[PDB]
Structures are given as C-alpha cells and as structure tokens.
Amino acid sequence: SVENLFDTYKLNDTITLKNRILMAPLTRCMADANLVPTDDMVAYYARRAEAGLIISEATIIRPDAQGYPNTPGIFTQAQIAGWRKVTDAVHANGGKIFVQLWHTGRVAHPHFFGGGDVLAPSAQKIEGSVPRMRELTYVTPKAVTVEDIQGLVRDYAKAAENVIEAGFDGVEIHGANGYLIDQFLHHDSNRRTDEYGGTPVNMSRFALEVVDAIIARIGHDRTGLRISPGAYFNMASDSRDRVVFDYLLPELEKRDLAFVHIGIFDDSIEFDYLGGTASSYVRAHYGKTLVGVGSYSAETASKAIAEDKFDLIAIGRPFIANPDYVAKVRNSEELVAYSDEMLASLI
Ligand SMILES: Cc1cc2nc3c(=O)[nH]c(=O)nc-3n(C[C@H](O)[C@H](O)[C@H](O)COP(=O)(O)O)c2cc1C
Ligand SMILES: Cc1ccc(O)cc1
Ligand SMILES: Cc1ccc(O)cc1
Ligand SMILES: Cc1ccc(O)cc1
Ligand SMILES: Cc1ccc(O)cc1
Ligand SMILES: Cc1ccc(O)cc1
Ligand SMILES: Cc1ccc(O)cc1
C-alpha cells in the first residue's frame, strides 16, 4: 500500500500540495525554435496536473545558457506568454507547477547562440559533443569574471521575476547535474583562486547568491533548489567535493526554502564520498523538506517516506511513459515501462 503518497503536504504557509508526488523536471527539446513553449507542451503538462507539483523541464535564463535544441526560455515576452498558457492550463486542472531555471555553463554550445562564449567557473572543457546533434563538439569555456558573475545572478533574478507574469507557483533553481551552479560546487569544474573558488565557503558563494537573489524577487516559500552532491553527469568526481556540500546544506537551511531536491538517476546507488546514498547524505545534513528521486517505484518511494528518508517523491521516466501515472498508482494499476524511444513523442 502506498497511501502515504496521497497525504496532503504543506510545504509552507504559501503552498500546500494535494499529494506527495512530483513530476520530475524532464528536458524534452520540443519548444519552438524561438524557445517559446508550444500548445503541445501546454497539453503535455496539463494532463499531468494530478501531480501534487510539476517541476517543468529545465528552462534557460538567457541565450548563452542553451546547450540542447529547442529547450524553452523565460527571458522574452513571447516565452513568458507561452508559459502563461501552460501554467493557466495546469491551474485550471487543479495542479501546481514550478519552473526549473537553467544555465548550462560549460555544457552550453555556441551553435545555439551565434558563436558567443561558453561560460563557466574555469576554462575546463568537458569531453564530447551535444547528444543527438551532428558534431557539436563542446568547447573550452571562458572562466567568468566577477562582472560576468554579477550579470548571471542578475539574470537568474530577472528570470525569477518573469515567473510571476508567466503564472508559475514558484521556481526550482537548477543547481544540479553538472550545470552552471553545480560547476561552482565541484572541484573538477571549479579551479578558481578568487573568492568564488578554493574553499567550501567560496565554492558555495555563487549558489547562495543566486538563491538569495531569487528569494528577494519571489520569496522563500516559492523557491526550491535541486542539487547533486555527487558527480558523474558531465562532472569528474573529486573526494574534496563532499565538504563543500557539508557547508552548503546548513547554509541553505537558513533560507527556509520550499524544498531541496536531489538530482540523480538511481538513488539505490551508494556514493563512496557521501558515505552512502545521495538522499541519506542530504537527509543527514539537512533538516527541512526533501524531495527524493531516482529509480523509485511508488512502492519503494512510499516505504522510504514512511521511513523518514525524505518527504516528497519526484517521478521522472514513469511520468513520460504514463501521463496518467498518479491515477494508475491510485488505482493500483499496471504502469508501462519507460524507454528512450518515447522521447520522440510529446504526450
Ligand atoms: C529524458 C530526461 C530528461 C531529463 N531532464 C532533466 C531536466 O531538465 N532537469 C533536471 O534537473 N533533471 C532532468 N532529468 C533527470 C530527472 O529529473 C530525474 O532525476 C531522473 O530521470 C531520475 O528519476 P526517474 O528514475 O524517476 O526517471 C532528466 C531525465 C531524463 C530521463
Ligand atoms: C530529450 C533530449 C535531450 C537532449 C538532447 O540533446 C536531445 C533530446
Ligand atoms: C573589481 C574586482 C572585484 C572582485 C574581484 O575578485 C576582482 C576584481
Ligand atoms: C512566483 C510568484 C507567483 C505568484 C505570486 O503572487 C508571487 C510570486
Ligand atoms: C537531458 C537532461 C537535462 C538536464 C538534466 O539535469 C538532466 C538531463
Ligand atoms: C506575500 C508573499 C507570500 C509568498 C511569497 O513567495 C511572496 C509574497
Ligand atoms: C540523460 C539521460 C537521458 C535518457 C535516459 O534514458 C537516461 C539518461
């Protein structure tokens, strides 16, 4: 039985979720070429509004954030208007939705923004090329200056202000999976020797500046953050990264966020440097609402939540395979298994 998944969950004084099930953020690359959400995306999200909370696909904050084709933005008026169609439709169906705000950092590709500079904490190139694209080889990033950093914080904040007009309930800051914010938090990507590098305090500075700037625009109750304390998504591991997160997590607790959300693919994996699973590490170092994710079934998520391992469950691949995920779980019905072939269709 997975009855506890259907518990009402009060995130805070501003937001109460009708159940504990989140739709995980899932990049689909189906926006129009000007990165405006389509009416097909409106339908896609609307039919998943039985989720207690939808986290949108990663949504870019400005042009040099783009690393994959046709990923939506939220920096133009047209993009804002497209998103407002999405959020209105979700709300009309009794749902709630946060936008996931993205900058890909060194994982951006200049093909998408007219040959400009790829930006990152340090000039450390990742291996390879953009998935499902013809020969878009990753390039050496420019190490951002302090002025670049100030502009990036400004642009995260502006994107968050835009979320109000776009009608979202809030923002999940994409601090995970080796993208820009996560690049500051890990030693592979952050080799800086200024006030943004070296020490746990310095390496956490960019993340906390973005969190605080966004809180200043939309409030702590409407602000969540995804993190990846481990590596292994466009990120080489480093035994020193854990102490960054040991510092960051209590600092985040001070902000009384809507939630912290782990960004991994299989939470059954034990990470050497975290002394165990990602969720158990975060749970040991962070005492507020926590969203677990990664290869959970409704049954294993329910048990984890009953065991106080985390509070909310994000479901990704099954939500692609099963738009009616929540109803099927509610009715104890068979779920279709996900396959990558499903990514070709937006349903
Ligand atoms: C096709 C695909 C796209 C994804 N896009 C995002 C994304 O935009 N932002 C994000 O933080 N995670 C992204 N993820 C990670 C998922 O949010 C989730 O953490 C992962 O799929 C594990 O959960 P699951 O086992 O329930 O699918 C993506 C995963 C997949 C498979
Ligand atoms: C779903 C997807 C994600 C990335 C990409 O480059 C292409 C397709
Ligand atoms: C002007 C300036 C400010 C900070 C810094 O780290 C370098 C230069
Ligand atoms: C993000 C947001 C949405 C509504 C609102 O009233 C304030 C902020
Ligand atoms: C394709 C993708 C995009 C973002 C992310 O965090 C994970 C996977
Ligand atoms: C009044 C208010 C409440 C929540 C919030 O995020 C912003 C403003
Ligand atoms: C990043 C990714 C994409 C597809 C997939 O099936 C797993 C992981």
From TrEMBL:
EC number, as in UniProt: 1.5.1.30
A Pfam short name: Oxidored_FMN
Protein source organism: Shewanella oneidensis (strain ATCC 700550 / JCM 31522 / CIP 106686 / LMG 19005 / NCIMB 14063 / MR-1)
Keyword match Nucleotide-binding: yes
Cofactor list: FMN
Amino acids binding FMNH2: 25, 27, 58, 100, 226, 295, 316-317
CDD domains: OYE_like_FMN
InterPro entries: Aldolase_TIM, OxRdtase_FMN_N, Oye-like
Family (UniProt): Belongs to the NADH:flavin oxidoreductase/NADH oxidase family.
Domain NADH:flavin oxidoreductase/NADH oxidase N-terminal: 5-331
Cited Gene3D superfamilies: Aldolase class I (3.20.20.70)
Name this protein carries in UniProt: NAD(P)H:flavin oxidoreductase Sye4
Binding residues for FMN: 25, 27, 58, 100, 226, 264, 295, 316-317
Recorded superkingdom: Bacteria
Keywords: Flavoprotein, FMN, Nucleotide-binding, Oxidoreductase
Gene Ontology annotations for the cellular component aspect, listed alphabetically: cytosol
Molecular function terms, GO-annotated: FMN binding; oxidoreductase activity, acting on the CH-CH group of donors, NAD or NADP as acceptor; riboflavin reductase (NADPH) activity
PANTHER family per UniProt: NADH OXIDOREDUCTASE-RELATED (PTHR22893), OXIDOREDUCTASE-RELATED (PTHR22893:SF55)
